[PDB]
CSV table of C-alpha atoms and ligand atoms in Angstrom, one decimal:
chain,number,residue,atom,x,y,z
L,1,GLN,CA,114.8,96.5,99.6
L,2,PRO,CA,112.2,94.3,98.0
L,3,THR,CA,113.0,90.7,97.2
L,4,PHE,CA,110.7,88.3,95.2
L,5,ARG,CA,110.0,84.6,94.7
L,6,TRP,CA,107.5,84.0,91.9
L,7,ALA,CA,105.4,81.0,91.2
L,8,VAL,CA,104.5,79.1,88.1
L,9,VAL,CA,100.8,79.8,87.8
L,10,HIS,CA,99.3,80.1,84.3
L,11,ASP,CA,96.0,82.1,84.0
L,12,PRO,CA,96.1,83.2,87.7
L,13,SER,CA,92.8,84.1,89.5
L,14,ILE,CA,93.2,86.1,92.7
L,15,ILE,CA,91.4,85.4,95.9
L,16,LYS,CA,92.1,86.8,99.3
L,17,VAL,CA,91.3,84.5,102.2
L,18,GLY,CA,92.4,86.0,105.6
L,19,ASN,CA,95.7,87.6,105.5
L,20,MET,CA,96.7,85.2,102.5
L,21,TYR,CA,96.4,85.9,98.8
L,22,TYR,CA,96.0,82.8,96.7
L,23,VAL,CA,96.2,82.3,92.9
L,24,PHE,CA,94.6,79.4,91.1
L,25,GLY,CA,95.3,78.7,87.5
L,26,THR,CA,95.4,76.3,84.7
L,27,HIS,CA,96.7,72.7,85.3
L,28,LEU,CA,95.7,73.3,89.0
L,29,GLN,CA,98.6,75.5,89.6
L,30,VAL,CA,98.1,77.1,93.0
L,31,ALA,CA,100.3,79.4,95.2
L,32,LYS,CA,99.9,81.8,98.0
L,33,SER,CA,101.6,84.8,99.4
L,34,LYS,CA,101.2,87.1,102.3
L,35,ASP,CA,103.1,90.0,100.7
L,36,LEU,CA,102.3,89.7,97.0
L,37,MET,CA,106.1,89.3,96.4
L,38,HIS,CA,107.2,85.9,97.8
L,39,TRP,CA,105.0,83.2,96.5
L,40,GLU,CA,104.7,79.6,97.9
L,41,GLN,CA,103.9,76.9,95.3
L,42,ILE,CA,101.1,74.7,96.6
L,43,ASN,CA,100.2,72.7,93.6
L,44,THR,CA,101.6,72.2,90.1
L,45,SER,CA,99.5,69.8,88.1
L,46,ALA,CA,96.2,68.0,88.1
L,47,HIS,CA,97.8,64.6,88.5
L,48,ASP,CA,95.7,61.9,90.0
L,49,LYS,CA,97.2,62.5,93.4
L,50,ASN,CA,97.1,66.3,93.7
L,51,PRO,CA,95.5,67.6,97.0
L,52,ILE,CA,93.3,70.4,95.5
L,53,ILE,CA,91.1,67.8,93.6
L,54,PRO,CA,92.3,64.2,94.3
L,55,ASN,CA,91.3,61.8,91.5
L,56,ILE,CA,90.0,64.8,89.6
L,57,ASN,CA,89.3,62.3,86.7
L,58,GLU,CA,86.6,60.7,88.8
L,59,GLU,CA,85.7,63.8,90.8
L,60,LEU,CA,84.9,65.9,87.6
L,61,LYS,CA,84.0,63.2,85.3
L,62,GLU,CA,81.1,65.2,84.0
L,63,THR,CA,83.1,68.0,82.5
L,64,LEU,CA,86.1,66.0,81.5
L,65,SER,CA,83.7,63.5,79.9
L,66,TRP,CA,82.2,66.4,78.0
L,67,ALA,CA,85.5,67.9,76.9
L,68,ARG,CA,87.2,64.4,76.3
L,69,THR,CA,90.3,65.2,78.4
L,70,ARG,CA,91.9,64.0,81.5
L,71,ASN,CA,94.3,65.2,84.2
L,72,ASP,CA,93.6,68.9,83.5
L,73,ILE,CA,91.2,71.9,84.0
L,74,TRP,CA,92.0,75.3,82.7
L,75,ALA,CA,91.3,78.8,84.1
L,76,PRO,CA,90.0,78.1,87.6
L,77,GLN,CA,88.6,80.8,89.7
L,78,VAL,CA,87.7,80.2,93.4
L,79,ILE,CA,85.2,82.6,94.9
L,80,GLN,CA,83.7,82.6,98.4
L,81,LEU,CA,79.9,82.7,98.1
L,82,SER,CA,77.3,83.8,100.8
L,83,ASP,CA,77.1,80.4,102.5
L,84,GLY,CA,80.8,80.7,103.5
L,85,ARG,CA,82.1,78.0,101.2
L,86,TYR,CA,84.7,78.2,98.3
L,87,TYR,CA,83.4,77.7,94.8
L,88,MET,CA,85.9,77.0,92.0
L,89,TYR,CA,84.6,77.9,88.6
L,90,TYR,CA,86.7,76.1,86.0
L,91,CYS,CA,86.5,74.9,82.4
L,92,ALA,CA,87.6,71.7,80.6
L,93,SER,CA,88.6,71.6,76.9
L,94,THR,CA,91.2,70.6,74.3
L,95,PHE,CA,93.5,72.9,72.4
L,96,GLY,CA,91.5,75.2,70.0
L,97,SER,CA,88.5,73.0,70.3
L,98,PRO,CA,85.1,74.5,70.8
L,99,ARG,CA,84.2,71.4,72.8
L,100,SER,CA,84.2,72.6,76.3
L,101,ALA,CA,82.3,73.2,79.6
L,102,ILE,CA,82.3,75.5,82.6
L,103,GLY,CA,81.8,73.6,85.8
L,104,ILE,CA,81.9,74.3,89.5
L,105,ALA,CA,83.6,72.5,92.4
L,106,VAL,CA,83.3,73.3,96.1
L,107,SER,CA,85.2,73.1,99.4
L,108,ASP,CA,84.8,74.4,102.9
L,109,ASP,CA,88.6,75.1,102.9
L,110,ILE,CA,90.4,77.3,100.5
L,111,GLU,CA,93.2,74.7,99.7
L,112,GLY,CA,90.7,71.9,99.1
L,113,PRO,CA,89.7,69.2,98.6
L,114,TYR,CA,87.2,70.4,96.1
L,115,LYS,CA,84.3,68.3,95.0
L,116,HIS,CA,81.9,68.3,92.1
L,117,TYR,CA,79.0,70.8,92.4
L,118,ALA,CA,77.5,71.8,89.0
L,119,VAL,CA,78.2,71.9,85.3
L,120,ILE,CA,76.6,75.1,84.2
L,121,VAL,CA,77.6,75.9,80.5
L,122,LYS,CA,78.4,73.7,77.6
L,123,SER,CA,79.6,74.1,74.0
L,124,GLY,CA,80.4,72.0,71.0
L,125,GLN,CA,77.0,70.1,71.1
L,126,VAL,CA,76.7,67.9,68.0
L,127,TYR,CA,73.0,68.2,67.3
L,128,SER,CA,72.3,64.6,66.1
L,129,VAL,CA,73.7,63.3,69.3
L,130,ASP,CA,73.6,66.1,71.9
L,131,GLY,CA,70.9,68.2,70.4
L,132,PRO,CA,71.1,72.0,70.6
L,133,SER,CA,73.2,74.7,72.1
L,134,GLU,CA,72.3,76.5,75.4
L,135,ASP,CA,70.0,78.8,73.7
L,136,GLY,CA,67.9,76.0,72.1
L,137,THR,CA,69.5,76.5,68.6
L,138,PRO,CA,72.1,74.4,66.9
L,139,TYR,CA,75.6,75.1,68.1
L,140,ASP,CA,77.8,77.1,65.7
L,141,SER,CA,81.2,78.1,66.9
L,142,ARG,CA,81.0,81.5,65.1
L,143,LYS,CA,78.0,82.9,67.0
L,144,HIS,CA,78.0,80.9,70.3
L,145,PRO,CA,80.8,81.2,72.8
L,146,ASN,CA,83.3,78.5,73.7
L,147,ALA,CA,82.5,77.5,77.3
L,148,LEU,CA,85.9,78.6,78.8
L,149,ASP,CA,87.5,81.1,81.1
L,150,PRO,CA,84.9,82.0,83.7
L,151,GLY,CA,85.2,85.4,85.4
L,152,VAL,CA,82.8,85.5,88.4
L,153,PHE,CA,82.2,88.7,90.4
L,154,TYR,CA,79.5,90.4,92.5
L,155,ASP,CA,78.3,93.8,91.5
L,156,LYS,CA,78.2,96.7,94.0
L,157,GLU,CA,74.5,95.6,94.5
L,158,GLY,CA,75.3,92.0,95.5
L,159,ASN,CA,74.1,90.5,92.3
L,160,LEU,CA,76.4,87.8,91.0
L,161,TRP,CA,77.6,87.5,87.4
L,162,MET,CA,79.9,85.2,85.3
L,163,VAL,CA,81.8,86.6,82.3
L,164,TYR,CA,83.3,84.0,80.1
L,165,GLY,CA,84.7,83.1,76.6
L,166,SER,CA,87.6,82.4,74.3
L,167,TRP,CA,87.8,83.0,70.6
L,168,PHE,CA,84.8,81.5,68.8
L,169,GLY,CA,81.5,83.3,69.3
L,170,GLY,CA,82.9,85.9,71.7
L,171,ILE,CA,82.7,87.0,75.4
L,172,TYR,CA,79.4,86.6,77.1
L,173,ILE,CA,77.9,87.5,80.5
L,174,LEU,CA,75.4,85.4,82.5
L,175,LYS,CA,73.5,86.6,85.6
L,176,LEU,CA,74.0,84.0,88.5
L,177,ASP,CA,71.8,83.3,91.6
L,178,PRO,CA,73.9,84.4,94.5
L,179,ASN,CA,72.6,81.7,96.9
L,180,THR,CA,73.5,78.8,94.5
L,181,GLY,CA,76.1,80.2,92.1
L,182,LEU,CA,74.2,78.7,89.1
L,183,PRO,CA,72.9,80.7,86.1
L,184,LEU,CA,69.3,82.1,86.4
L,185,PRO,CA,67.0,80.2,83.9
L,186,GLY,CA,66.4,81.1,80.2
L,187,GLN,CA,69.3,83.5,79.4
L,188,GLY,CA,70.9,80.8,77.3
L,189,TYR,CA,74.6,81.9,76.8
L,190,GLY,CA,73.8,85.3,78.0
L,191,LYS,CA,74.5,88.7,76.6
L,192,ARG,CA,77.4,89.1,74.2
L,193,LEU,CA,79.8,91.8,75.3
L,194,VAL,CA,82.7,91.5,72.9
L,195,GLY,CA,83.8,89.5,70.0
L,196,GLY,CA,82.2,87.0,67.6
L,197,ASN,CA,83.2,85.2,64.5
L,198,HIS,CA,86.5,83.7,65.8
L,199,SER,CA,87.9,86.9,67.3
L,200,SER,CA,91.3,86.4,69.1
L,201,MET,CA,90.3,87.2,72.7
L,202,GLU,CA,89.9,85.2,75.8
L,203,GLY,CA,90.4,85.5,79.6
L,204,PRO,CA,87.7,88.1,80.5
L,205,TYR,CA,87.7,89.5,84.0
L,206,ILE,CA,85.6,92.2,85.4
L,207,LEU,CA,86.8,94.2,88.4
L,208,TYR,CA,84.6,96.8,90.1
L,209,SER,CA,86.3,100.0,91.2
L,210,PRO,CA,84.7,101.9,94.1
L,211,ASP,CA,87.0,104.9,93.2
L,212,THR,CA,85.4,105.5,89.8
L,213,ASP,CA,82.2,103.6,90.3
L,214,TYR,CA,82.8,101.8,86.9
L,215,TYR,CA,83.2,98.2,86.0
L,216,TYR,CA,86.4,97.4,84.1
L,217,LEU,CA,86.5,94.5,81.6
L,218,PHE,CA,90.0,93.2,81.1
L,219,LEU,CA,90.8,90.9,78.2
L,220,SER,CA,93.6,89.0,76.5
L,221,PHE,CA,93.9,89.6,72.8
L,222,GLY,CA,96.1,87.2,70.6
L,223,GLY,CA,98.2,84.0,71.1
L,224,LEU,CA,99.5,83.0,74.5
L,225,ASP,CA,102.7,81.5,73.1
L,226,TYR,CA,106.1,83.1,72.7
L,227,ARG,CA,105.1,84.3,69.2
L,228,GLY,CA,101.4,85.0,69.8
L,229,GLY,CA,101.5,88.7,70.8
L,230,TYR,CA,99.4,88.2,73.9
L,231,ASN,CA,98.4,91.5,75.3
L,232,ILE,CA,96.1,92.8,78.0
L,233,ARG,CA,93.2,95.1,77.0
L,234,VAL,CA,90.8,97.2,79.2
L,235,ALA,CA,87.3,98.5,78.8
L,236,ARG,CA,84.7,100.0,81.1
L,237,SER,CA,81.0,100.4,81.9
L,238,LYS,CA,78.6,101.9,84.4
L,239,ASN,CA,77.0,98.6,84.2
L,240,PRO,CA,78.3,95.1,85.2
L,241,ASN,CA,76.7,93.7,82.0
L,242,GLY,CA,77.8,96.6,79.8
L,243,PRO,CA,77.8,97.7,77.2
L,244,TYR,CA,81.7,98.2,77.6
L,245,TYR,CA,83.4,101.2,76.0
L,246,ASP,CA,87.1,101.8,75.4
L,247,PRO,CA,88.8,105.2,76.0
L,248,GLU,CA,87.9,106.5,72.5
L,249,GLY,CA,84.3,105.8,73.1
L,250,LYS,CA,84.0,102.8,70.8
L,251,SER,CA,81.7,100.0,72.0
L,252,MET,CA,83.2,96.7,72.7
L,253,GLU,CA,80.1,95.2,71.3
L,254,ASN,CA,81.6,96.2,67.9
L,255,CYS,CA,84.9,94.6,68.6
L,256,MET,CA,85.2,91.6,66.2
L,257,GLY,CA,87.3,90.4,63.3
L,258,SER,CA,90.8,89.7,62.2
L,259,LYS,CA,93.6,90.6,64.6
L,260,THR,CA,94.2,93.7,62.7
L,261,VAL,CA,90.6,94.9,63.4
L,262,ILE,CA,90.2,94.0,67.0
L,263,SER,CA,93.6,95.7,67.8
L,264,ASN,CA,91.7,99.0,67.1
L,265,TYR,CA,89.6,98.6,70.2
L,266,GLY,CA,90.3,98.7,73.9
L,267,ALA,CA,93.1,100.2,76.0
L,268,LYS,CA,96.2,98.1,75.5
L,269,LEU,CA,97.8,98.0,78.9
L,270,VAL,CA,101.0,96.1,78.1
L,271,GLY,CA,102.6,93.9,75.5
L,272,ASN,CA,106.1,92.6,74.6
L,273,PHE,CA,109.0,94.8,75.6
L,274,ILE,CA,112.5,94.6,77.0
L,275,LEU,CA,114.5,97.4,78.8
L,276,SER,CA,117.7,96.6,77.1
L,277,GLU,CA,119.7,99.1,75.2
L,278,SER,CA,121.7,96.3,73.3
L,279,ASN,CA,119.2,93.7,71.9
L,280,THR,CA,115.8,92.1,72.0
L,281,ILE,CA,117.1,89.1,74.1
L,282,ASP,CA,119.1,90.2,77.1
L,283,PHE,CA,118.6,88.0,80.2
L,284,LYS,CA,120.1,90.8,82.6
L,285,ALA,CA,117.3,93.1,81.4
L,286,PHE,CA,113.7,93.4,82.5
L,287,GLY,CA,111.2,92.3,79.8
L,288,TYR,CA,108.1,90.2,79.1
L,289,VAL,CA,106.8,88.4,76.1
L,290,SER,CA,103.0,87.6,75.8
L,291,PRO,CA,101.8,88.9,79.2
L,292,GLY,CA,98.2,88.3,80.0
L,293,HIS,CA,95.2,86.4,81.1
L,294,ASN,CA,94.9,88.4,84.2
L,295,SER,CA,92.7,88.9,87.1
L,296,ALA,CA,92.6,91.9,89.4
L,297,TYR,CA,92.1,92.9,93.0
L,298,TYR,CA,91.1,96.0,94.9
L,299,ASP,CA,92.7,96.0,98.5
L,300,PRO,CA,90.2,98.0,100.5
L,301,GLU,CA,92.7,98.2,103.5
L,302,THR,CA,95.2,100.2,101.5
L,303,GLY,CA,93.3,101.5,98.5
L,304,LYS,CA,95.7,99.9,96.1
L,305,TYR,CA,94.8,97.9,93.0
L,306,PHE,CA,96.9,94.9,91.6
L,307,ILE,CA,96.9,92.9,88.4
L,308,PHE,CA,97.8,89.2,88.4
L,309,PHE,CA,99.0,87.7,85.2
L,310,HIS,CA,101.3,85.3,83.6
L,311,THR,CA,104.2,86.1,81.2
L,312,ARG,CA,106.9,84.5,79.1
L,313,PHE,CA,110.3,86.3,78.8
L,314,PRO,CA,112.4,87.5,75.9
L,315,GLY,CA,114.5,84.5,74.6
L,316,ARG,CA,113.1,82.1,77.1
L,317,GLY,CA,110.4,80.5,75.0
L,318,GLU,CA,107.4,79.0,76.6
L,319,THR,CA,108.6,79.2,80.2
L,320,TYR,CA,106.3,81.4,82.2
L,321,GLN,CA,105.8,82.8,85.7
L,322,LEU,CA,103.3,84.6,87.8
L,323,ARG,CA,103.7,88.4,87.9
L,324,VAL,CA,102.0,91.0,90.1
L,325,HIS,CA,102.0,94.7,89.2
L,326,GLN,CA,100.2,97.6,90.8
L,327,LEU,CA,97.6,99.4,88.7
L,328,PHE,CA,96.8,103.0,89.2
L,329,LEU,CA,93.8,105.2,88.2
L,330,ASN,CA,94.6,108.2,86.0
L,331,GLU,CA,92.8,111.5,86.0
L,332,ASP,CA,90.2,110.2,83.5
L,333,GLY,CA,89.5,107.0,85.4
L,334,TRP,CA,91.4,104.6,83.4
L,335,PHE,CA,94.0,102.1,84.6
L,336,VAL,CA,97.7,102.4,83.9
L,337,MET,CA,100.1,99.6,84.8
L,338,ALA,CA,103.2,100.1,86.9
L,339,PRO,CA,106.2,99.4,84.7
L,340,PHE,CA,107.8,97.0,87.3
L,341,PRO,CA,106.4,94.3,89.7
L,342,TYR,CA,104.9,95.4,93.0
L,343,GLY,CA,107.4,96.3,95.5
L,344,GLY,CA,105.5,97.9,98.4
L,345,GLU,CA,105.3,101.2,96.5
L,346,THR,CA,102.6,103.7,97.3
L,347,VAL,CA,102.1,106.7,95.0
L,348,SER,CA,102.8,110.2,96.3
L,349,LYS,CA,103.5,113.7,95.0
L,350,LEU,CA,107.2,113.9,93.7
L,351,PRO,CA,109.1,117.1,93.6
L,352,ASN,CA,110.5,118.4,90.2
L,353,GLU,CA,114.0,117.1,91.0
L,354,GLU,CA,112.7,113.6,91.0
L,355,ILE,CA,110.7,114.1,87.7
L,356,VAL,CA,113.0,116.0,85.5
L,357,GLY,CA,115.6,113.9,83.5
L,358,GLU,CA,116.3,111.4,80.9
L,359,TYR,CA,113.9,108.4,80.5
L,360,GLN,CA,113.7,105.1,78.8
L,361,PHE,CA,110.4,105.4,76.9
L,362,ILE,CA,108.3,102.5,75.9
L,363,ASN,CA,105.3,103.0,73.7
L,364,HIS,CA,103.3,99.8,73.7
L,365,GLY,CA,101.2,100.9,70.7
L,366,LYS,CA,97.9,99.2,69.6
L,367,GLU,CA,98.9,96.1,67.6
L,368,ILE,CA,98.7,92.4,68.3
L,369,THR,CA,102.3,91.7,67.5
L,370,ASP,CA,105.1,89.4,68.7
L,371,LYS,CA,107.7,92.2,68.3
L,372,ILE,CA,109.6,93.0,71.4
L,373,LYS,CA,109.5,96.7,71.7
L,374,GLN,CA,112.7,98.5,73.0
L,375,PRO,CA,112.9,102.0,74.6
L,376,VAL,CA,113.9,105.2,73.1
L,377,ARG,CA,115.4,108.1,75.1
L,378,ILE,CA,113.4,111.2,76.0
L,379,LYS,CA,113.9,114.0,78.3
L,380,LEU,CA,111.5,115.6,80.8
L,381,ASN,CA,113.0,119.1,81.1
L,382,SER,CA,112.4,121.7,83.8
L,383,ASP,CA,110.7,124.1,81.4
L,384,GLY,CA,107.9,121.6,80.7
L,385,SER,CA,109.4,120.5,77.4
L,386,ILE,CA,109.9,116.9,76.2
L,387,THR,CA,112.8,116.4,73.8
L,388,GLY,CA,115.1,113.6,72.5
L,389,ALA,CA,113.2,110.8,70.8
L,390,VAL,CA,110.0,112.7,70.8
L,391,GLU,CA,108.9,116.2,71.0
L,392,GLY,CA,106.2,117.7,73.2
L,393,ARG,CA,105.1,119.0,76.6
L,394,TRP,CA,104.6,117.4,80.0
L,395,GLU,CA,102.9,118.7,83.2
L,396,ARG,CA,101.6,117.1,86.4
L,397,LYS,CA,99.1,117.7,89.1
L,398,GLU,CA,99.9,115.7,92.3
L,399,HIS,CA,100.8,112.2,91.0
L,400,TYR,CA,98.9,112.7,87.8
L,401,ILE,CA,101.0,113.3,84.7
L,402,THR,CA,100.0,114.6,81.3
L,403,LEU,CA,102.3,114.3,78.3
L,404,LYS,CA,101.5,116.1,75.1
L,405,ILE,CA,103.6,114.3,72.5
L,406,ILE,CA,103.9,115.3,68.8
L,407,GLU,CA,103.3,112.3,66.6
L,408,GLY,CA,103.4,113.2,62.9
L,409,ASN,CA,100.6,115.7,62.0
L,410,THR,CA,98.8,115.5,65.4
L,411,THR,CA,99.3,116.1,69.2
L,412,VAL,CA,98.6,112.9,71.3
L,413,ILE,CA,97.7,113.5,74.9
L,414,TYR,CA,98.7,110.6,77.4
L,415,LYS,CA,97.5,110.7,81.0
L,416,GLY,CA,99.0,108.7,83.7
L,417,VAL,CA,100.7,108.5,87.0
L,418,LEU,CA,104.1,109.3,88.3
L,419,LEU,CA,105.8,107.4,91.1
L,420,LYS,CA,108.9,105.9,92.6
L,421,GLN,CA,109.1,102.1,92.0
L,422,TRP,CA,111.7,99.5,92.5
L,423,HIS,CA,113.7,98.8,89.3
L,424,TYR,CA,113.4,95.1,89.1
L,425,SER,CA,116.6,94.4,87.2
L,426,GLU,CA,118.6,97.3,88.5
L,427,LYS,CA,117.7,96.8,92.2
L,428,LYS,CA,117.2,100.4,93.1
L,429,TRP,CA,114.4,103.0,93.6
L,430,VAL,CA,113.7,105.0,90.3
L,431,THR,CA,111.1,107.5,89.1
L,432,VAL,CA,108.7,106.1,86.5
L,433,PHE,CA,105.5,107.1,84.7
L,434,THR,CA,102.7,105.2,83.0
L,435,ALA,CA,100.1,107.0,80.9
L,436,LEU,CA,97.4,106.3,78.5
L,437,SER,CA,95.9,108.1,75.5
L,438,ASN,CA,92.4,108.4,74.2
L,439,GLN,CA,93.2,106.0,71.3
L,440,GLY,CA,94.1,103.4,74.0
L,441,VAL,CA,97.9,103.5,73.8
L,442,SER,CA,100.1,103.0,76.9
L,443,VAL,CA,103.5,104.6,77.5
L,444,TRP,CA,105.9,103.7,80.3
L,445,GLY,CA,108.8,105.9,81.2
L,446,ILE,CA,111.6,104.8,83.4
L,447,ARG,CA,114.1,107.6,84.5
L,448,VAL,CA,117.7,106.9,83.9
L,449,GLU,CA,119.5,107.6,87.3
I,1,CA,CA1,88.8,81.8,84.3
């Protein structure tokens, strides 16, 4: 019987230190958990007297100076580097301002205190005063990134890379020197991977999967607010520095434009939804609004993958919390997200008896939208048919499920996983599935039991 206690961490970056998992996020929100379920809140704001960075205003005067803010840093990620020490990549900025910088702070202990190390990327240079951008040319917030949202990771060859960006000129990758954690010289902003021209995307994170030998790029498309339609998107590459491709085979290098256009690309993992049969705001029902800015983790001791993200909730406005879901790999080597938060579940072959039945069916679609999707009712029947709200065919091999679902003029194939999970609102073990189509659409099914 899982129980949970969540923490308030916005833009949470996962790091394992010992037998403890730690998330760091915006406003210096920090919390730790042994079990991924019960979180202990360790810091809540970047007030003068916080313990992670005391007197941050003086400690990080270089970045905060640059970004004209105080008593804040956004999007921190702590990584342990090869010297043994903890390196917190962070950014400082102001709301929707291209005036920002990625900095680094450093500590021998995970929980701090962190001190000033480097400022490594800057944006919003006003040529007359500051001279040019990082690439030696005049800054221009259409084609250059906003220096925010560092995602740092090692490649399977021990090279070190930072992916970063938010809106503005897009998402870029810089190769880093593993001994120092600073960018190698003369790459400027790096190589563009996604976006450009004020595309609505931020929060890049690249996780390497030893199970598929691909790098996955995860992004957040849209507004973080209650009405912003924040959703999580995935792409993948053989290479850490791309190019990244979505499940259709489009290149993420081509992903740029209005919200309408960029919604076409990527695999949308999740967006707004509520498991209520009565309305779009039902506090007894499980639901999220604007889930995203995630990170990810591969636990090599168990073989499981997790995603760490923030979310708002239907009817609850801006209030948010940390959530942790298991991610699974489907037959085609794409991630699908467990419908409910992680409850110690470990996939396994289910017999028919546990698969056949009536389901609540959520099709998260492809749009950047603030709409709170609600389920329909489908049936997985013993003869392999699907009926009710949709028509089609299902089949499974082991834990891998395939649904062939008639949708207008066409048959859409979704491929995913089947498993028992804990029903977060219903407090009981149910069968669920989670599958993904080639056009990048995610469907979750929760059996009605
Ligand atoms: Ca970040």
